[PDB]
């Protein structure tokens, strides 16, 4: 219905705003675009589902997220990919891992403060009806 389409449009607006606020944070620059294979050639072989904030924006615009839970799965993926690919004790690896956890924590904190639980519940119930 028109009301359900209005609901998902509001969701997309909300998700674009959250994602933009993450994307403009200097700490998260490394997560804004896909990994360049010329810089990191074994990434594609090690990480089976690459995810980044530009891919998240594309997925929002392709109507791929019907709930905030589905969106947070991809944010969690950005984080888990970083922990998997950069597991070493070296400062480079430790920096990106800290940034990855910060990205995750920041996304969850924004959502905790600004997502209405009844709005998310509505999204989930519409999704479950399809
Ligand atoms: C998304 C991503 C991008 C990336 C780009 C370059 N190098 C990586 N990993 C290196 C693997 C071996 N040890 C050093 C690591 O690079 C650390 C470096 C810290 C600064 S940063 O801006 O977070 C880019 C990664 C990278 N690992 C990644 O997971």
Curated annotation (Swiss-Prot):
Induction: Up-regulated in breast, uterus, colon, ovary, and stomach tumors. Induced in breast cancer cells overexpressing NCOA3 or treated with estrogen. Down-regulated in 5-fluorouracil-resistant derivatives of the colon cancer cell line HCT 116.
Domain Bromo, chain residue ranges per copy: 3-114
Tissue/organ expression: Highly expressed in estrogen receptor positive breast tumors and in osteosarcoma tumors.
Domain of life: Eukaryota
Coiled coil: 108-130
Disulfide bond residue pairs: none
Location of this chain's protein in the cell: Nucleus
Assembly description: Interacts with ESR1 and NCOA3 and these interactions are enhanced by estradiol. Interacts with acetylated lysine residues on histone H1.4, H2A, H2B and H3 (in vitro).
Function in brief: May be a transcriptional coactivator of the nuclear receptor ESR1 required to induce the expression of a subset of estradiol target genes, such as CCND1, MYC and E2F1. May play a role in the recruitment or occupancy of CREBBP at some ESR1 target gene promoters. May be required for histone hyperacetylation. Involved in the estrogen-induced cell proliferation and cell cycle progression of breast cancer cells.
Family per record: Belongs to the AAA ATPase family.
Protein name: ATPase family AAA domain-containing protein 2
Organism: Homo sapiens
Name of the encoding gene: ATAD2
Full-length numbering of the shown residues: 981 to 1108 of 1390
């Amino acid at each position: 219905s028109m009301q359900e389409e209005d609901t998902f449009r509001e969701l997309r607006i909300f998700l674009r705003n959250v994602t933009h606020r993450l994307a403009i944070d200097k700490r998260f620059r490394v997560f804004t675009k896909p990994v360049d294979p010329d810089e990191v050639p074994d990434y594609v072989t090690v990480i089976k589902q690459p995810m980044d904030l530009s891919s998240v924006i594309s997925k929002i615009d392709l109507h791929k997220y019907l709930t905030v839970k589905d969106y947070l799965r991809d944010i969690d993926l950005i984080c888990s990919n970083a922990l998997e690919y950069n597991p070493d004790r070296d400062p480079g690896d430790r920096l990106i891992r800290h940034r990855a956890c910060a990205l995750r924590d920041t996304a969850y904190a924004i959502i905790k403060e600004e997502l209405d639980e009844d709005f998310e519940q509505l999204c989930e119930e519409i999704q479950e009806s399809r």
